């Protein structure tokens, strides 16, 4: 709290002692002009801050004063679209109907005072007032019942903002205890001009995959989910493509998301997430791209995280950071060959009937596999698996015999499994060792900082701890 009596920079002393984003204040209109004026000098009117005010602050006017930052949240009653005549008509009905209920109930006459009270007030005192009958009024499609203190329980609150033209514009409505808003995510527009760096608030795209990133529906106890988890706006393809299609808030967690949550506590980020639309990772076909790689090349999001594989083609168009987890490709079989040179893989012309491969199409390995020797892949064209879980059960039943995919996830699936019946060939044999990292837009200044910070956590012994929680070993 601040003492206006000391109207000098002593207030700025107490005011300077708070560092945070959202500031809430409760003061009068005249003092509001001065306090916001002082903040603009120090810099709290910056682009990163949010001001929240109650109704009484400048609500009952159409001419805004100066020194108020462009962009303000208030919940008021001003009722932009309502009319006084509408309010008066409701008020008149409250008068007549409530008195009608009391008068007709007991033939009650509302005895009036002979004048304004000099002496003749006393005889009307014993007469019962309308309070027992004025608390409850009906009609007009609204429970206009009052209370002891004289405030309604069914009001008409609205939320309103300061637009660019210094003209108040309605945003959302409050009715039947819900927050209906015309805005899904915050607009984040600037303060009063001549101060607008606006170089922050990165957007991030992510895919739902193996334990790197996991998606879940929002818990219905409080329409949110437990702390230590980040919300993310998943798109949908609507119901039967009839119409609409709702951007549904559903928080998501996992490994890759956790690392940036701790990462952005030392680089001061502000972030939002939305998942993918089409495809799984991406492929450069017909000289065009789609996927997260496609998203970044067209500036959909400055950053891009998740399960992303570093490779020759990918680094040609977009830059990559220093990898933090080692991986590659591997093969998984049930319960009889040495590897990429094994003669069994060379030709299916052996005495035994041919066996099959998993080799999920439209991936990263397939493009790499095409590069060295083709004849295996045209064999793989005949039989292509789908998904991940669908592939493993097919191997378990005996529809396939040699599943090929990246090792960083096969070791997990073999670990958290039943009976340890599935293993990888050899002692964790690996081919074409490769790392996983975070890709950023080309030429961005984020390059040096994001690299240095990511390397620092590796030294502090944090990767081991985070690995253990989401990389468990049951068969180990």
């Amino acid at each position: 709290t601040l003492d206006t009596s000391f109207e000098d920079a002593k207030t700025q002393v107490q005011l300077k002692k708070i560092h945070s984003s959202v500031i809430l204040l409760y003061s009068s209109k005249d003092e509001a002009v001065l306090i916001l004026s002082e903040a603009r000098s120090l810099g709290l009117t910056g682009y990163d801050f949010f001001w929240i005010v109650p109704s009484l602050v400048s609500g009952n006017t159409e001419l805004i004063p100066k020194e108020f930052p462009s962009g303000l949240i208030s919940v008021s009653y001003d009722d932009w679209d309502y009319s006084l005549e509408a309010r008066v008509r409701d008020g008149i009905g409250i008068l007549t109907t409530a008195a009608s209920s009391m008068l007709e109930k007991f033939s009650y006459i509302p005895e009036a005072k002979a004048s304004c009270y000099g002496q003749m007030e006393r005889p009307e005192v014993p007469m019962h007032t309308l309070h027992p009958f004025m608390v409850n009024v009906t009609w007009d499609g609204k429970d206009l019942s009052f209370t002891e203190e004289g405030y309604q329980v069914h009001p008409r609150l609205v939320v309103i903002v300061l637009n660019k033209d210094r003209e108040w514009e309605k945003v959302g409505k409050w009715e039947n205890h819900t927050l209906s808003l015309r805005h899904a995510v915050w607009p984040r527009y600037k303060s009063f001009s001549d101060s607008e760096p606006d170089d922050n608030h990165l957007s991030i795209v992510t895919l739902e995959e193996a334990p790197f990133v996991i998606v879940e529906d929002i818990d219905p106890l409080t329409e949110t989910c437990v702390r230590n988890t980040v919300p993310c706006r998943k798109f949908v393809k609507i119901n039967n493509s009839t119409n609409e299609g709702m951007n549904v808030k559903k928080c998501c967690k996992g490994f890759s998301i956790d690392i940036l949550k701790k990462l952005s506590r030392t680089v001061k980020f502000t972030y939002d997430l939305y998942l993918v639309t089409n495809g799984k990772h991406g492929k450069k076909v017909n000289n065009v791209w789609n996927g997260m790689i496609g998203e970044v090349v067209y500036q959909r999001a400055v950053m891009a995280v998740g399960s992303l594989t570093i490779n020759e083609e990918r680094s040609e168009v977009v830059d990559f950071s220093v990898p933090f987890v080692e991986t590659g490709i591997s093969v998984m079989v049930s319960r009889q060959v040495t590897g990429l040179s094994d003669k069994k893989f060379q030709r299916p012309h052996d005495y035994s009937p041919p066996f099959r491969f998993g080799t999920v199409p439209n991936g990263s390995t397939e493009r790499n596999i095409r590069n060295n020797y083709p004849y295996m892949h045209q064999y793989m064209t005949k039989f292509n698996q789908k998904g991940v879980e669908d592939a493993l059960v097919s191997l378990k039943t005996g529809k396939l015999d040699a599943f090929i995919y990246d090792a960083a996830v096969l070791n997990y699936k073999a670990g958290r499994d039943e009976g340890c019946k599935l293993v990888t060939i050899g002692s964790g044999y690996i081919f074409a060792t490769t790392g996983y990292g975070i890709a950023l837009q080309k030429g961005s200044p984020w390059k040096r900082q994001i690299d240095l910070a990511l390397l620092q956590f590796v030294g502090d012994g944090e990767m081991e701890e985070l690995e253990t929680l989401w990389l468990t070993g049951i068969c180990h």
Epitope: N163, E169, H183, A184, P187, Y189, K190, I238, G245, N247
Partner: nanobody
Framework: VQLQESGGGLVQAGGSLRLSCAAS????????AGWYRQAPGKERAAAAA???????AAADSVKGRFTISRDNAKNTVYLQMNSLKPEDTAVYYC????????????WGQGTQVTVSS
């Protein structure tokens, strides 16, 4: 939201044009604006983009022929195109995405640009 595209016509090869797409909204600071091209027999293709931060990306296919610009004060994005070639004959479209909303792919009626001798 709704947008509106205009600026087309017939111009000889090597000429120039000024296409424009505009929309109404009080938050116009934060929208990706992109240009799409779709010729007969070919899929829709990206041409030029503008980011929220203020970066410009140009497609390598017809790089250098045109240029993009956005006015923060007035809600309109107009595309300045130069050194026209017959390969550019198509109907250009304007679009936006994100900052709220849903069902995110927004397409105008269309403006046809014709380049010929």
């Amino acid at each position: 939201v709704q947008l509106q595209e205009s600026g087309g016509g017939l111009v000889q090869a090597g000429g120039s044009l000024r296409l424009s797409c505009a929309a109404s909204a009080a938050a116009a600071a934060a929208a990706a604006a992109g240009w799409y091209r779709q010729a007969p027999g070919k899929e829709r293709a990206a041409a030029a983009a503008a980011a929220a931060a203020a970066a410009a990306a140009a497609a390598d296919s017809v790089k250098g022929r045109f240029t993009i610009s956005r006015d923060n004060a007035k809600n309109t994005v107009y595309l300045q195109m130069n050194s026209l070639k017959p390969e550019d004959t198509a109907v250009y479209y304007c679009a936006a995405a994100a900052a709220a909303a849903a069902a995110a792919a927004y397409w105008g009626q269309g403006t046809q640009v014709t380049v010929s001798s």
